[PDB]
Amino acid sequence: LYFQGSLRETSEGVILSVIVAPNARETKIVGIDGTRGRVKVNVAAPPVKGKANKELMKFFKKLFGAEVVIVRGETSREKDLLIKGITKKEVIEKLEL
In the complex with Na ion, which residue's Cβ is closer, 79 or 88?
79
Give the residue from 90, 33, 23 showing the smallest Cα distance to 63. 90
Neighbours of 59 (CB within 10 A): 20
Least distance in angstroms from the C-beta of 7 to Na ion: 22
Which positions from 19 through 78 interact with Na ion, judged by CB under 5 A?
47, 50, 52-53
Look at residue 83 and give its three-state secondary structure.
strand
Tell me which residue has its CB nearest to Na ion.
52
In the complex with Na ion, which residue's Cβ is closer, 65 or 71?
71
Least distance in angstroms from the C-beta of 35 to Na ion: 24
User: DSSP strand E in the chain: where?
Assistant: 7-10, 13-21, 28-33, 38-42, 68-72, 78-84
Residues of this chain that interact with Na ion (CB under 5 A) are 47, 50, 52-53
